[PDB]
Amino acid sequence: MRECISIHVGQAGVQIGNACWELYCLEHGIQPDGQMPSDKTIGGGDDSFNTFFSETGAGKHVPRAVFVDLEPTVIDEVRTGTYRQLFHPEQLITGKEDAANNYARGHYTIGKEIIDLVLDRIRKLADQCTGLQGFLVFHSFGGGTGSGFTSLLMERLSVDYGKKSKLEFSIYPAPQVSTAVVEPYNSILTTHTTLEHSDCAFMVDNEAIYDICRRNLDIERPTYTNLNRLISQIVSSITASLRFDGALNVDLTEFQTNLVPYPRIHFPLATYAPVISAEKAYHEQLSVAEITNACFEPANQMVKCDPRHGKYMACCLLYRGDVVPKDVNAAIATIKTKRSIQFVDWCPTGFKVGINYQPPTVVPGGDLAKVQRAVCMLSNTTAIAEAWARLDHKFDLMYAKRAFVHWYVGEGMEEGEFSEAREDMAALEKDYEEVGVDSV
Amino acid sequence: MREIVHIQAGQCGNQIGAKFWEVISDEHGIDPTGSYHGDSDLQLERINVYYNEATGNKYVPRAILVDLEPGTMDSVRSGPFGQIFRPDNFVFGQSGAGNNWAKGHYTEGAELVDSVLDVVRKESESCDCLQGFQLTHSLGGGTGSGMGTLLISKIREEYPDRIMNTFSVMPSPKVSDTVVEPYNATLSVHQLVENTDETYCIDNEALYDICFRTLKLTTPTYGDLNHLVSATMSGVTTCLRFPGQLNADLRKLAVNMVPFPRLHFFMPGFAPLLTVPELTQQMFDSKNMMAACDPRHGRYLTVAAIFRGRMSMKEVDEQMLNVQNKNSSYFVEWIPNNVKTAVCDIPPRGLKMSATFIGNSTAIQELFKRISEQFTAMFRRKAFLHWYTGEGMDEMEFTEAESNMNDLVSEYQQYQDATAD
Amino acid sequence: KREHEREVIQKAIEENNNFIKMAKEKLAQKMESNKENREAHLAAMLERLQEKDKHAEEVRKNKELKE
Ligand SMILES: COc1cc2cc(c1Cl)N(C)C(=O)C[C@H](OC(=O)[C@@H](C)N(C)C(=O)CCSSC)[C@@]1(C)O[C@H]1[C@H](C)[C@@H]1C[C@@](O)(NC(=O)O1)[C@H](OC)/C=C/C=C(\C)C2
Ligand SMILES: Nc1nc2c(ncn2[C@@H]2O[C@H](COP(=O)(O)OP(=O)(O)OP(=O)(O)O)[C@@H](O)[C@H]2O)c(=O)[nH]1
Ligand SMILES: Nc1nc2c(ncn2[C@@H]2O[C@H](COP(=O)(O)OP(=O)(O)OP(=O)(O)O)[C@@H](O)[C@H]2O)c(=O)[nH]1
Ligand SMILES: [Ca+2]
Ligand SMILES: [Mg+2]
Ligand SMILES: [Mg+2]
Numbered sequence: 001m002r003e004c005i006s007i008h009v010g011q012a013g014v015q016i017g018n019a020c021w022e023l024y025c026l027e028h029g030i031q032p033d034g035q036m037p038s039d040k041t042i043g044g045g046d047d048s049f050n051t052f053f054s055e056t057g058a059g060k061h062v063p064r065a066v067f068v069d070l071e072p073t074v075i076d077e078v079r080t081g082t083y084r085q086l087f088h089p090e091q092l093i094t095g096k097e098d099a100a101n102n103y104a105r106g107h108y109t110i111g112k113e114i115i116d117l118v119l120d121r122i123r124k125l126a127d128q129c130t131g132l133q134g135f136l137v138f139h140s141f142g143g144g145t146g147s148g149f150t151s152l153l154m155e156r157l158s159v160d161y162g163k164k165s166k167l168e169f170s171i172y173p174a175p176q177v178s179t180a181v182v183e184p185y186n187s188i189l190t191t192h193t194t195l196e197h198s199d200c201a202f203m204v205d206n207e208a209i210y211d212i213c214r215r216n217l218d219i220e221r222p223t224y225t226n227l228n229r230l231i232s233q234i235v236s237s238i239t240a241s242l243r244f245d246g247a248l249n250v251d252l253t254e255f256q257t258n259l260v261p262y263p264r265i266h267f268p269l270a271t272y273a274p275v276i277s278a279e280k281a282y283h284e285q286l287s288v289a290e291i292t293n294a295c296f297e298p299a300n301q302m303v304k305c306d307p308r309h310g311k312y313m314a315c316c317l318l319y320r321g322d323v324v325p326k327d328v329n330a331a332i333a334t335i336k337t338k339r340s341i342q343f344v345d346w347c348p349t350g351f352k353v354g355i356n357y358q359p360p361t362v363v364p365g366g367d368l369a370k371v372q373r374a375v376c377m378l379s380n381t382t383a384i385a386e387a388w389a390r391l392d393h394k395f396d397l398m399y400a401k402r403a404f405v406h407w408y409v410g411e412g413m414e415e416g417e418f419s420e421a422r423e424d425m426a427a428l429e430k431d432y433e434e435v436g437v438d439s440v
Numbered sequence: 441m442r443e444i445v446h447i448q449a450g451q452c453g454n455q456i457g458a459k460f461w462e463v464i465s466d467e468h469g470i471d472p473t474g475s476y477h478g479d480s481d482l483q484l485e486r487i488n489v490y491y492n493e494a495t496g497n498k499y500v501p502r503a504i505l506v507d508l509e510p511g512t513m514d515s516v517r518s519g520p521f522g523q524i525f526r527p528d529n530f531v532f533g534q535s536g537a538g539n540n541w542a543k544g545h546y547t548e549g550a551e552l553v554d555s556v557l558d559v560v561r562k563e564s565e566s567c568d569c570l571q572g573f574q575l576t577h578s579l580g581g582g583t584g585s586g587m588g589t590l591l592i593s594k595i596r597e598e599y600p601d602r603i604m605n606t607f608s609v610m611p612s613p614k615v616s617d618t619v620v621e622p623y624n625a626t627l628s629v630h631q632l633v634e635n636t637d638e639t640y641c642i643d644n645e646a647l648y649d650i651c652f653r654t655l656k657l658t659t660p661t662y663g664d665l666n667h668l669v670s671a672t673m674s675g676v677t678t679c680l681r682f683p684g685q686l687n688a689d690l691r692k693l694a695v696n697m698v699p700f701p702r703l704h705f706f707m708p709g710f711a712p713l714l715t716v717p718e719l720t721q722q723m724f725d726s727k728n729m730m731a732a733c734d735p736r737h738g739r740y741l742t743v744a745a746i747f748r749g750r751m752s753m754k755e756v757d758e759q760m761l762n763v764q765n766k767n768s769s770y771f772v773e774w775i776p777n778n779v780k781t782a783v784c785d786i787p788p789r790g791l792k793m794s795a796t797f798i799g800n801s802t803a804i805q806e807l808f809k810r811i812s813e814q815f816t817a818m819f820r821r822k823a824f825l826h827w828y829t830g831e832g833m834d835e836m837e838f839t840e841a842e843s844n845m846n847d848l849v850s851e852y853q854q855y856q857d858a859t860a861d
Numbered sequence: 862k863r864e865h866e867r868e869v870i871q872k873a874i875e876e877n878n879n880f881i882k883m884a885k886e887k888l889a890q891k892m893e894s895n896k897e898n899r900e901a902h903l904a905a906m907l908e909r910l911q912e913k914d915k916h917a918e919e920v921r922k923n924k925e926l927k928e
Contacts, residue, residue, distance in 0.1 A: 096569045097442075100691040108895045159885045163877055175777045176757070179685060181696050181742065184776070197884070221753040394776045397860060401774050403699035412899035546920045597910045600903055634909075832924030 001131030004051050004242055005122065006065040006138065009153065010146035011074045012171045013138035014067050015224055019232035019363075020138075021063050022083060024052060024243065027236065027361045033085045034060035048245045054128055064125055066091050068118050068153075070110050070145045071098035090121055099144025101180035103189045104411030106148020115152055119160060126161075133253075134165030134199070136239075141190055141391075142173040142183035151193035158197045165199045165253075169235060172303065172387060174207035177224070182404045184394040185418070191388075192421035195428070200256055200266045202238065203387060204231055205303040215299065216275040217367045229366055234272045234302060237318055237376035240356045248325065250354030255316045258352055259380050264431055265313070269384050270302040271295045271377040274369075281369035288323055288373065289331040295377035296339050303387050308340035310383030311436045315341075316352045321359040321373035328353055344382075345438050385432035392425050441488035442689055443567040444680065445560065446503040446574055447591065450584025452609050453577035454505060454512050455662065456642075459670040460576065461501055462521050464490065464681060466789055467674065472521045474498040482786065485683045492526075492566070504529050504559050506591075508548050508583040509536040529563070531556050537582025541624040542831030544586020553590055560595060572603030572637075572690045576673075579628040580611030580621035580644075589631035596635050603690035604636045607673060610731075610807060612645035613814075615665070620824050622814035623838070629808065630841035633848055637694045638704045640676060640798075642669055643807060645732040654713050654727060671788065672708050672730055675796025678746050678784050686782040687744055696780060697742045697800050702848060703855070705804050707731030709797030716751055720759040723797040724767070731807055738803030739856050740771045743779040749793025753783055773860045802856035805849045812845060 008017035028049045030036045036059070039045065043057045053061040063086060069075050072094040078084065079092055095114050099106030126132055135157060140146035157166060173183040180186075194201075209230055213222035217230075241252050260266045273294035274286045294300050295317070298307065319328065332351050335341070343349045360374040398404065399418060409415070448457030465471075468487055469478025476484065476497060491499040503525060505516060510532040516522050517530070535548040543549065564570050573595055577584030592604055608628070611621035632639055647668050651660035679687045687693040698704045708730045711722040723745065726734045747756050760781050764771060771778060788794055819825070819838060829835065 098689075098692075100689070101695050104895075108892065109899065112892060155884060155888050159881050159888070162881055178777060178780070180692070181775060181778055181780070221757065397774045397776055398699075400860075401699075401855070401858060403775055404695065406701050407695055407698075410899070410902055412895035412897075412902070414894075414898065542920075546917055547924070550917065550921070593910055593913055597907065600906055600910075830924075830927075832920040832922070832927075834920075834923075 001046065001129070002051055002133045002242070003064055003129040003131065004133055004136055004239075005125050005129075006052070006063070006136045007122070007153070008065065008067045009137065009139040009150045010069055010143045012140035012143060012146055014069055014074050014078065016138050016169070016171075016228050016231055016235075017065065017067060018078060018081070018083070019228035020235050021065065021086070022363060023232045023236050023361065025083070025086070026363065027358070028053070028061075028243070030061050032083050034062060036061050049243050051133075051242050052239070062086070062088060063091070066093065066118065066121055066125065068093045068114075068149070069098070070095040070106065070114065070149065072096065090124070093118055093121060099148050101142070101182060101186070102144040102407055102411060103148040103186045104408045104413045106144040106146075107152045107193075108148070108413070109411050111149040111152050115149075115156060118153065119156055123160070132164065134167065135161075136167050136169065138169045140171040140173070141187035142171070142178065142180060144186065146171070147186035147190040151190050154194045154197040166197060168194070168198050168201035170201055170203045172203045172205040174205060174210060176210050177206055177227075182407070184391055184398065185404065185408070187391050188395050188421050188425055189417070192424045195264060195424065198266065200260060200268070202270055203267060203303050203384070204234075204270075205387065208302055208304050212275055212300065213367070217277055219367060226367060229363055229368065230275065233360070233368065233374075234270055234376055237272065237320060237374065238270070238378070240318070240320055240358065241354060244356050244358050246355070246357050248355035250352070255318070255352060255354070255378055258314045258316060259378060261313055261347070261380070261435065262431070264428060265380065265435060267384050268314075268378045269305065269307065269381050271300050271379070272302070273300050273375055274371055275300065276369050276371070277367065278369040281371060286371060286373070288319075288327040289334065291373065291375050292317065292328070292331040293335055295375060296335060296341070303384060305381070305383040305386040307379065307381040307383045310381045312341060312343045312379060312381055313347055313435065314352075314380035316354070316378040318354050318376045318378065319373065320356040320375070321371070323355050323373050325353070325355070328355075344436060382432050382436040385429055388425060388429050388432075392422070392429065395422060441486070441568050442571045443502060443569070444489055444571060444574055444690065445563050445567070446490065446501065446576075447506065447560070448503065448576045449506040449588040449591065450577050450581050451507065451512050452581065453575070453584045453588065454507060454516055456607070456609070456666050456669045456673070457503070457505070457576040458516050458519060458521070459666050460673045461503065461524075463670045463674045463789070464677070465521055465524070467786070468681070470499050472524050474500055474524050480786070482682060486681055489680055500524065500526055502563055504531065504556065504563065506531050506556055506587070508533040508544065508552065508587065510534060529559050531559055537586065539580070539618050539620055539624065540582045540827055540831065541586045541627045542828050542833050544583045544588070545590045545627075546833070547831050549583065549587030549590050553587065553594055556591060557594060557598070561598070564599065570599070570602060572605060573599070574605040574607065574690075576607045578609040578611070579625040580609070580616055580618060581624060585624040585628045589628050589635075592631065592635045603638070603694060605638050605690055606632060606636050607640045607642055608632060610641060610643040610645070610811070612643065612648060614648040615644040620818070620827070622811055622818060623828070625811050626815045626845055627838070627841050629811070629845050629848070633702050633844060636704065638690070638697060638706065641705050641707050641731045641804065641807060642672070643731045645810070646730050649732065650713060650727070668710065668730065672710050672796065674788060675710060675746055675748070675794070676708055676798055678748060678796070679782050682784055682786065684782060684784065686780050693744070697744060697798070699741050699775060699800075700851070700855070702851060703741065703800065706798050706800050707733055707735075707804055707807075709799065711795045711797070712791075714793065716755040717759050719747065719793065719795040720756075720763055723795045724763055728797070731804065732810070733801065733803045733806040735799065735801045735803050736770060737806060738770075738801050738852070741775060741778065741800040741802065741855065743800070744782070744798040745779070746782045746784060746796045747793070748784045748795070749787035749791070750785060751783075751793055756781060756783065772855065772858070774858060802852045805852045808845055808849050812842070812849070815842060
């Protein structure tokens with residue numbers, strides 16, 4: 001059992017869902033129609049991949065997922081895409097009118113008209129679970145749906161499912177692919193509203209992913225397709241422990257125990273390696289030491305920040321492929337005596353390691369090379385607060401003049417909600433500052 | 441889908457309106473019969489935005505043609521793509537305003553307006569999800585200026601939760617010898633500032649200068665001016681008509697362009713009149729603005745730019761970054777990332793590559809100051825004011841309209857002098 | 862010890878229910894407050910348009926009362 005229900009909200013969440021679920025299928029040898037020849041237990045089973053896939057009597061493996069967007073054009077592509085047979089039509093939920101890059105419309109005006117339906121469809125999945133573990137919510141900070149509707153959903157989920165764990169994969173905005181000027185507003189409002197209702201959130205800086213595609217894959221102008229295929233690999237690495245089993249396999253919840261010292265401090269920094277082209281990876285084997293050392297190159301992080309100017313509260317290493325503990329321990333020992341790694345005084349400095357012998361997988365016609373081994377580091381650093389700082393600065397510049405605020409007020413919101421949210425972010429920045437100070 | 445209901449009022453409105461439909465119908469690849477004969481599916485991806493699909497795959501423009509004189513009505517029906525328009529959507533009076541703002545707004549138009557709303561209502565009720573209305577008209581006349589602003593208030597009553605867009609043509613003594621125009625404009629602006637969400641400032645003073653000084657056309661016809669308008673209107677609607685990401689609907693455009701509700705008057709631009717750096721420098725040049733205003737006399741609150749044709753997205757991104765750095769003082773710093781760029785693979789007709797510009801600049805006040813200067817020159821003498829008061833109007837409504845536009849100018853000035861700290 | 866063991870698990874249930882409770886109420890409060898504000902904004906908008914109609918009736922009336 002221990003099923004995980006994925007919820008994909010808005011364009012970003014949906015399209016990333018396509019990349020993730022396409023990648024999951026290839027890893028588990030599941031076909032686009034949902035059949036899985038290697039699975040002999042027809043109609044059901046308690047295997048590891050059943051945490052993400054339910055089974056029908058006809059042998060179809062169906063994603064435990066729901067796609068939600070207040071406009072249809074993005075999900076319509078899923079309904080007619082390569083993996084259309086994969087999803088039951090009720091898993092794909094659409095409205096007729098989007099939130100127009102407005103948190104208010106996504107959370108109140110338009111969102112309230114579909115929230116009940118969504119929760120009903122989620123309940124239908126949850127009732128198929130013999131031991132539901134929690135939810136995985138994919139969404140953007142910038143969009144009106146990803147911002148507004150998500151926060152509404154997270155609140156409702158806390159009511160309908162109590163303290164059932166709820167993880168986030170948040171798409172932190174970047175100017176290279178931004179869609180709206182008010183994305184800073186939507187970002188702060190969602191972070192504030194979702195904070196009490198989220199147990200752990202993995203932020204993905206689009207600019208970080210943008211730079212990695214330009215730098216490491218030599219893509220002159222990365223599209224959402226380029227970004228998502230890279231993102232899906234990080235997501236796959238993080239969920240690999242849930243979808244597979246093994247001796248040296250460590251469950252994601254165990255990492256989460258180390259990654260969250262306090263409830264509000266639940267934003268781990270993700271760093272993935274190796275990201276390399278087929279051209280460069282040819283006749284070039286990246287050892288365990290090389291990819292592990294790459295986890296401490298800030299150019300490989302999912303979020304733009306400098307851990308070297310911050311303090312570690314946790315450091316987790318999620319390996320997959322041809323990796324053994326011996327090579328890991330050696331690589332870690334070398335790194336500790338050569339890198340700017342410093343922990344806060346109130347936590348142990350031991351790196352927590354997990355290994356999934358299942359090697360990495362790549363989607364056909366992709367830019368990523370197929371490597372024998374990969375790694376994703378999940379660290380809890382104070383440096384991630386820089387991401388909050390950059391967003392909060394842009395928020396303050398506009399709100400000082402109350403620019404674009406009328407679009408929110410017109411939809412029923414109050415200026416008190418803006419100030420309330422900003423104060424919470426200010427406290428959050430202060431919290432990350434306090435945890436770094438040495439003990440008395 | 442997401443349908444837009446088009447409306448064209450008055451002579452000027454129907455002229456540019458007809459041309460607007462001629463150009464995009466060619467881009468989407470449909471003939472005056474309403475049949476599709478294109479080659480790319482991208483032409484029909486979002487065709488429903490401006491067209492109604494009828495029996496036998498017949499695409500009918502979701503347009504409503506209006507005027508207080510039946511003359512222009514035959515012009516459209518006789519002109520090209522005249523057989524494509526819906527016959528019932530033709531709504532015509534027998535009056536003729538004669539450049540009086542009161543007749544169109546209170547008297548003559550107030551009688552014909554209901555029969556227009558019936559057509560608006562019939563069109564709207566068949567929309568899967570109506571996003572709003574776009575109006576083409578002039579502000580110097582009587583019908584387009586008067587009745588055009590009446591319809592807006594009336595439509596906004598029945599459709600208050602929809603976006604109201606307008607392509608307002610500004611008057612200029614270089615094109616029209618009509619003397620009373622600065623009244624109709626001011627009275628129109630008094631309305632547009634209150635009841636529209638976004639207004640493209642098409643300026644005849646600018647259109648004239650372009651044709652004359654740049655294109656080298658002495659004594660330019662309206663056909664010359666409209667070739668600029670049609671190219672402009674085709675550009676600023678590209679994001680609405682083809683599958684895209686940036687400003688794909690009227691609301692998302694307004695959200696990104698309008699930081700304050702009253703400040704929704706954009707100055708469009710077009711280029712050329714090449715390589716990527718050339719296009720980028722031209723579209724930001726004052727010579728290429730369809731509003732007689734120098735952007736270097738103020739600051740950009742927001743900017744939207746579309747590049748059309750096959751080009752390197754890398755080069756476009758680098759140049760758009762380059763301009764913002766070299767001209768950083770002309771972008772308000774208290775709105776980060778206020779410049780957005782779009783790219784459409786399909787170029788316009790004739791051009792291998794082009795670029796359209798939409799800017800919310802505080803330098804727009806130069807346009808409203810020109811009108812205000814011409815207005816007060818007439819109003820101080822009460823010149824021809826009896827033509828207005830005779831229709832039941834008051835001297836106050838002229839005063840209120842004047843001061844309201846004076847506020848708009850000062851408000852554009854306020855946020856121009858504003859700083860981060 | 863047995864008594865304490867009961868008080869702990871009872872405290873866990875209490876706090877969990879309180880979080881669900883406060884979350885449910887805090888939400889219902891916001892959706893209600895948002896409904897009032899948005900309606901009041903649309904209500905005000907129409908009222909200003911209603912005043913334009915009334916003004917137009919006064920203009921047309923004023924015309925025929927000058928003949
Ligand atoms: C004192 O010196 C004069 C004298 C006259 C005209 C002007 C001047 Cl400066 N000029 C140049 C204006 O612009 C006056 C403007 O009227 C226009 O705009 C013209 C150009 N009109 C109405 C046209 O239709 C174009 C040619 S006729 S095409 C068959 C007055 C300044 O304010 C307008 C006024 C509002 C208008 C005049 C009158 O048209 N009827 C109206 O309803 O109002 C009425 O129609 C029944 C029009 C008659 C024109 C008159 C009063 C002669
Ligand atoms: N990484 C990634 N980011 C995306 C993708 N699609 C959109 N985004 C980002 O999402 C932000 C805007 O949110 P969207 O998801 O597009 O909007 P939405 O959730 O549909 O909400 P609406 O405003 O109602 O349309 C932008 O800053 C984009 O950069 C994607 O496919 N991949
Ligand atoms: N750019 C452009 N401007 C025009 C065109 N036709 C008229 N105008 C302008 O419109 C202004 C007058 O408004 P009109 O549209 O002619 O008036 P109308 O809508 O027909 O209503 P009436 O008052 O009854 O004539 C003048 O200042 C003209 O310069 C046109 O075809 N192109
Ligand atoms: Ca099975
Ligand atoms: Mg969307
Ligand atoms: Mg006319």
